Design a protein around this ligand. Structure first.
Ligand SMILES: [Mg+2]
Ligand SMILES: [Mg+2]
Length: 164
RNA sequence: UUAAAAUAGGGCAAGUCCUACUCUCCUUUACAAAGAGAACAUUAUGAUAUGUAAUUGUAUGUUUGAUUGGGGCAAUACUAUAUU
């Protein structure tokens, strides 16, 4: 809705330049980047794409020379894939146990107390608590946060760039 | 002699769809290595090290050829005797 600053004053949408909007949507691991990938407005984006293009069902149309040869398209595909390093987008994954049912134990937020026989656990709460020894033990499995390790995801060094 | 891309020449198992397998990429609770740290023994309750002590962890490797199975062989030969 209305964007409020630190002081609490409102900023109109005309004041925000488009470079900032592309910045928020470009920030990985955010809702804006996820909304761009999965569709910010499915009904609105479909009609927008349908109008800007030739048509939803129209194919190989002529507007009111010679087409590109197959030997050219093959050469253009090689120069795009192996020289310009242009790749296609991939999918984003989601927890299946939580996506199917949000109010189960696979999603988390269990209101039960697993530890029995203590009186301090019921008082200690909060989103961030104190855990002793995480620097040497970790959560278990994956412990580093994002953008910590090298050559992760599409930037793998096992199969090269074009393999992704 | 001049000018034209019609053919030859100048690289091409290609394009779309469906199915299946794999690679890649994510997850850790088990497999091997892990460069990080610990704890312990020894001299001191003050420092440098060596270990036969390491059962902790995070990136890395692997994780669908089961014949490494199943059969058969089963002391009391030979000549006789009795029993169920
Ligand atoms: Mg590990
Ligand atoms: Mg692994």
């Amino acid at each position: 809705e209305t964007i409020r600053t630190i002081n609490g004053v409102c900023i109109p949408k005309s004041m925000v330049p488009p470079s900032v909007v592309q910045l928020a949507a470009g920030q990985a691991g955010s809702f804006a980047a996820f909304a761009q990938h999965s569709g910010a407005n499915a009904y609105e984006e479909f009609l927008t794409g349908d109008a800007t293009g030739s048509g939803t069902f129209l194919e190989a149309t002529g507007s009111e020379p010679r087409e590109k040869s197959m030997r050219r398209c093959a050469l253009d595909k090689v120069l795009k894939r192996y020289v310009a390093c242009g790749r296609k987008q991939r999918s984003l994954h989601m927890q299946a146990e939580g996506y199917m049912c949000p109010w189960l134990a696979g999603a988390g937020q269990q209101a039960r107390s697993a530890v029995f026989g203590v009186t301090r656990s019921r008082a200690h709460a909060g989103g961030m608590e104190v855990l002793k020894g995480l620097k040497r033990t970790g959560f278990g499995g994956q412990s580093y946060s994002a953008r910590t390790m090298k050559n992760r995801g599409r930037s793998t060094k096992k199969t090269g760039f074009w393999a992704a």
